[PDB]
């Protein structure tokens, strides 16, 4: 039973139930976002996804906001980009400087959309925060002070990993992301947090500082460690093997590897 | 220049000019190498309001060209524009 | 320094006869000069 | 107001618009499409066939006397089956104006040359043969500027390499500069640069 | 091809400095793209710098500040006078006068000096970039510029009197390398070549870029067509450039030097390293670069040698997909067959010297 | 289709017979003005050999194309455009031999 | 700065030539440049700094001659908080 | 708008043909320019004394590439690669692994003084001005592998002309 | 009567007004043989008209160059030749007929 | 049936020797982006790299290493290969399937969909 809505006054019929953001997939547009990741439950934390619908006073999350019958998506309405600079100054408030020497800088998803739909100057007059960071294991460094809580970690870890012991411990602007106690997240899947950290929160230990996104080469694989045959990317810089990246096979693996294969 | 009054006018009388007026070689006349420091203003776009990116995004402003004709689908002749005005011979120096 | 000659020859250097144990009577060059005074020599600075 | 922003001249935009119209109603048998760009920039894009025609016709006044080759070059598009876009730049000094005139060709294709009508696109004409792989037929004399006398690839192709395939050296057993496989010392560190985020949502193509 | 002395026929083979720039663009960002414009044309290259500037500008949809185009206007009729000092100076030295060569060179060597303060290098800056200019002028450095500007006149005026009523000098160049109007245009020749024929055409004020606009000067024009008049255009030339100086030494703006936008422009230090938004744009900017929107555009303007133009098209990515660099030189060159004819070799030697031909520009 | 020179494959190959004429009999010239050290047999050889490189080209546009290209070195080497270096380009003396079969290629290095 | 077996100054990266490799020849009547300066020895000498605040931010002093400013959290009592660029070292007094 | 150079008529009248006459078989207008070389030769020569003098330089100036460090003495560098991105000459090869302090360091930063074009980016874009082009431009070498330089050589160029390179900046971080 | 046009190679006419009376009237005659609804027909046949119109009217040369604003009476006097000569070929090419083809599917699409 | 490979000027070695791989690059999945999926790329077989003795950069002898193609379609990436001669392979698109997404669903009664935190 499909449904007619407009993304910019562009018919497009999708299912009931589909989210404005898979709407706006449907006609190619891409909602920024910073919480949503389509292998994960919906969470509507990140708020990037604000997008004005047409006739309606209130910007919605695209993300979380199932699509009605003749709704028209404004996606690149002045409330949409409004929207989108305060939550991207809001991130980048106390976000540390530190793209220069986090390995995320190149490919982090947070300085992309702060290129592409962010003000391109900081009106913060004040102290930024810091947050102390935590051990989780030997295979993740965490600088837990760039954490946006965008909790794609915890979902992660509740989800797919199954392993409950990555939660939110505090309230406003002190809550913190990571185990309360001095666990060790311990999983097959560990790994592919790194993956899902937008910002360089969470980084690869073995790979940390060795090399840059734009200098690698990346090579389209299959791993040899299990039979299960998952699709990874080898990067390599002058011939050399600097990390193990997932590529996303639905039918064999979704967009994880195994610790062992990564 | 350190040249004596002879030289100095030799040189003039061969030239036909006052060359001590102008010297080609620099003097005491040049800015001193060490210059009090700087204070650089700040440009139109450093407001704490009002001051949305989405107003003064010029590149989001380009749009891609608009066609005029497309074959896959009385009027006055028209020029690509108007004729260029003769130019004016100069008031300062009309000839050299 | 002979600031009534013209810029450009206004300031100027006499190396050194002997410098890094080398005999620098007749062989001079330019990287003899220490940093310290080569941009009071270079007029980078007017102060020595 | 919007002192960044680079200010737009309308009237401009209408002239070259109209203008535009006019050649197209002109001639119709050559023209396939014209547009005007909003930096006030008019573009014609012709039939292969009608290099010769329209470009006479653009020199002599139909109220228009573009006189002036300003430049002519192609660009190679290996997506289109006519890889290379041959451009021509023209100016007309009594209406202070500048049109574009763009047409496509194949690599073994050849389009007329422009020698007879403009006779500045001999050498440019020249260059884009040896360059790219155009070639002009009729052409006074077509032969290789900008590259060695014995060069075999052609360059700025989009398939060959920056580097090339042959390196140059001097061999002390023959006496000579000699040709030789590239073996470069350190290997130019190709950067993937695009960001995976689109930037300019006007210029968004059809999903398709 | 000479039977005696007199040039049968005249063809120029080039490529003995082509260095594949449009290739390598390619593979470069549009700042990275920048120094080779300087590297171009060697004599002229804050004008090459000023045209790439103002395509990727146009391309971009942004507008200079105004500080920065007065600035741009200043450096490049000081690139004028510098380009026009040699292409004169080295014609008369191929022709043998010799000493106008070292005696303008010393001026040359000023205006090197100013480029230095205000770039650090004495040619081939990187000062006019897309946006605007790098820094602005170091404290000091407008004054200078006046004391060189109001002396520059004698000097010039002192080569007048070594080479323009010269006799040997009118004989070498008062009839040779005529060229007539429409041969002139439809063989593609800009500035000079055109004005010495008589045509009355100077993109400066035909189709002003950034603030000629607003400056007063004259168009030198000439009545022969001839490398002599071809001279007399050139020092007048240089003389305008002087005036032009002037004009812009006394209105210069104040105010910022690059576009207030720093998707485009980068920000300035201590913002990039005091605030989040600055330091990711400066990184991404220093990294991938701008992204321009796609499209193509012919830009031009009047350089020192003629008309130079740039052919950007834009895939909307961070690096241009095809860059066409019109050097002026390059049609000055294939038509210096038609004005060999009926020459000898002295000749064809004045007839190179006066279409003032920089092969990096025509090579590329 | 627009035929570049020649309708059909027979004009062609007449083309390309003319063309090879006119080198055959440069060749001498071109050994006694370039001073090279090879024979004149040497030297129309290597002009045959590069002939029959392109022998399997099956489109009258190609072989014309070609033909192109061998008059513009022609000329070149009529002239004195190519120097010495340029005409010996085409003796690769100073490339080694690179041997063809497997167990060479597996021997020297990881090249297919 | 150690010496190698061989006689080498090995770098503060590490790097020493092996006695089986043959690049060594190239230091045979020639010098190999080592910086004596080693910045983990200066880095490591510097004091650590005692401040009563949880949160520090170091600009790598000089203002914007130094490094980006970050904010460091100082609140573990067992390791002293280090700054990303410049290395300095911070602890909350007792 | 337009000068007309030339597009004058002489004079017929006798005066003014005695005068062209005379300068035609008297020689009044090469002697004029006799004249003006006369004067200059008695005028000074701009020639400066090197090495012993030397020419004028600004503090933006351009030169040997120098690694520096902080006032601790710690390598200012942090394995950013930024200047390697924006190297128009991919003159610069940077590798860096976590040092044993565990901070982020450079094992290898090689910028070859053969392929760099000295176009004075990198020191614009390095975030903790790490490399700074130096004062020094008489560096020239006896052979093409002394301008491949190592980290060891910029560092020991860094620590020989600090003195110098921060009074520049000093003078010129403003305008930046 | 203008001593000289200003610019090489442009010689002084005459007699200005016969020549271009003339010229006008040639191409006319030409653009007669085009067929009527052809646009370039249309609109030569205005523009030329109004020039000669003009030409007539005004007497002074003068004049007359500040009303056709084609510059001197000589650049107007070129400029009706090659309008001459276009007209004579365009009557060979016959623009005036419909496209020869359309463009492939995807000739002209910027970006790729 | 076309063949420009004797026109294009490539020696024969990598004409032949070189297979070239016709692919949609997949998203880097470090990012969330996929506006770098949009178009087809041809990218040639890797060879050897070995490092250079004086300073240990990676030197080549593959002048195509870095030589990489655009492509709208995958046909037209194939014409292109075929006109030039070079092997090639085509790895088909890959998509994302589409996916129910609910938010109701993380506070499910009796299904297992519920969220603990
Ligand atoms: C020093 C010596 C330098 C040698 C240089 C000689 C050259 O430039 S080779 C250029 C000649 N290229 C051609 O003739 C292309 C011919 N293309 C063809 O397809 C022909 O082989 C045909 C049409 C199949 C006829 O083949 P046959 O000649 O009957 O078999
Ligand atoms: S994770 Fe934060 S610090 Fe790291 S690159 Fe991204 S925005 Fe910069
Ligand atoms: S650590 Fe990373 S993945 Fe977890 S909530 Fe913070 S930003 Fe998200
Ligand atoms: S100055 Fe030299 S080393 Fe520095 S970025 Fe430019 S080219 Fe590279
Ligand atoms: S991620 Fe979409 S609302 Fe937060």
Known sequence: NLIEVFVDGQSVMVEPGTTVLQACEKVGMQIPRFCYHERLSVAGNCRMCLVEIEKAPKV???????????????????????????????????????????????????????????????????????????????????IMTRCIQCTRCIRFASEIAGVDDLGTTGRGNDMQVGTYIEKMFMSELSGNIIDICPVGALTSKPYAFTARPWETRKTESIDVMDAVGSNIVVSTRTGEVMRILPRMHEDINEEWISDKTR | ASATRVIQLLRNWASGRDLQAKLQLRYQEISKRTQPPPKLPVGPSHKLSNNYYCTRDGRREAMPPSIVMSSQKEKKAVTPAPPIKRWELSKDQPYL | EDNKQFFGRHRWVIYTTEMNGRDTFWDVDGSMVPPEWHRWLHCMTDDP | TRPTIRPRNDVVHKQLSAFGQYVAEILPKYVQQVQVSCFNELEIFIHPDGVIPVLTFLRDHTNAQFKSLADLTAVDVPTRQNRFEIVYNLLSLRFNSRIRVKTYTDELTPIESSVTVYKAANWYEREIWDMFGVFFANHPDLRRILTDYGFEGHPFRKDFPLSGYVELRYDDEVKRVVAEPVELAQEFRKFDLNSPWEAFPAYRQPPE | ELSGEMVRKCDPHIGLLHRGTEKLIEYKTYLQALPYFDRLDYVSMMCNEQAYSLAVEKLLNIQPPPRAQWIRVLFGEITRLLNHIMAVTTHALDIGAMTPFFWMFEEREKMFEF?????????????????????????????????????????????????????????????????????????????????????????????????????????????????????????????????????????????????????????????????????????????????????????????????????????????????????????????????????????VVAIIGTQDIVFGEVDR | VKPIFSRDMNEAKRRVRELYRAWYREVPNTVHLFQLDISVKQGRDKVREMFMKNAHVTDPRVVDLLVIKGKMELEETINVWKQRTHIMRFFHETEAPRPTDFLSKFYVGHDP | VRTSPTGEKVTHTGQAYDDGDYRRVRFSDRQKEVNENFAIDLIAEQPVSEVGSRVISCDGGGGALGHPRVYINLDKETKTGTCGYCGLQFRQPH | TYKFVNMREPSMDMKSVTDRAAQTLLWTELVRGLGMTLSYLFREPATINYPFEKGPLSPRFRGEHALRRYPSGEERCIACKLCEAVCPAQAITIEAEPRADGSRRTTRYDIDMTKCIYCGFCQEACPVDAIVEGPNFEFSTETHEELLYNKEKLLNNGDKWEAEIAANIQADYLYR | LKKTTGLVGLAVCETPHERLKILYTKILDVLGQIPKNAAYRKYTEQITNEKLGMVKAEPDVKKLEEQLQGGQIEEVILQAENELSLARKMLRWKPWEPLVEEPPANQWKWPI | KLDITTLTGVPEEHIKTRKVRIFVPARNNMQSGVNNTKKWKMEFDTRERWENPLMGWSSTADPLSNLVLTFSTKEDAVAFAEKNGWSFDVEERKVPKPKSKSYGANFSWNKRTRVST
């Open chain 1, 60 to 142: 919605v999350a695209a993300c979380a906001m199932p699509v009605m019958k003749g709704w028209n998506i404004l996606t690149n309405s002045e409330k949409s980009k409004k929207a989108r600079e305060g939550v991207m100054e809001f991130l980048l408030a106390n976000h540390p400087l530190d793209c220069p020497i986090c390995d995320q800088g190149g490919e982090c998803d947070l300085q992309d959309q702060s290129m592409m739909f962010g003000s391109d100057r900081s009106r913060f007059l004040e102290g930024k925060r810091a947050v102390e960071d935590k051990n989780i294991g030997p295979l993740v460094k965490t």
């Open chain 5, 115 to 347: 480029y230095e303060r205000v770039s650090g290098a004495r040619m081939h800056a990187a000062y006019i970039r897309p946006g605007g200019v790098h820094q602005d002028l170091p404290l000091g450095l407008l004054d200078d510029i006046y004391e060189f500007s109001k002396n520059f006149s004698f000097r010039i005026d002192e080569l007048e009197e070594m080479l323009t009523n010269n006799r040997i000098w009118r004989n070498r160049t008062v009839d040779i390398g005529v060229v007539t109007a429409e041969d002139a245009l439809n063989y593609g020749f800009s500035g000079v070549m055109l004005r010495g024929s008589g045509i009355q055409w100077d993109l400066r004020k035909t189709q002003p870029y950034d603030v000629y606009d607003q400056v007063e000067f004259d168009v030198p024009i000439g009545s022969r067509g001839d490398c002599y008049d071809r001279y007399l255009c050139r020092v007048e030339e240089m003389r305008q450039s002087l005036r032009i100086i002037s004009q812009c030494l006394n209105k210069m703006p104040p105010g910022e030097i690059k576009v207030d936008d720093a998707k485009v422009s980068p920000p300035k230090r201590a913002e990039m390293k005091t605030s989040m938004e600055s330091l990711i744009h400066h990184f991404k900017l220093y990294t991938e670069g701008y992204q321009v929107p796609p499209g193509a555009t012919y830009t031009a303007i009047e350089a020192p040698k003629g008309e130079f133009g740039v052919y950007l098209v834009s895939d909307g990515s961070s690096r241009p997909y095809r860059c066409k660099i019109k050097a002026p030189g390059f049609a000055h060159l294939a038509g210096l067959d038609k004005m060999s004819k009926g020459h000898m070799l002295a000749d």
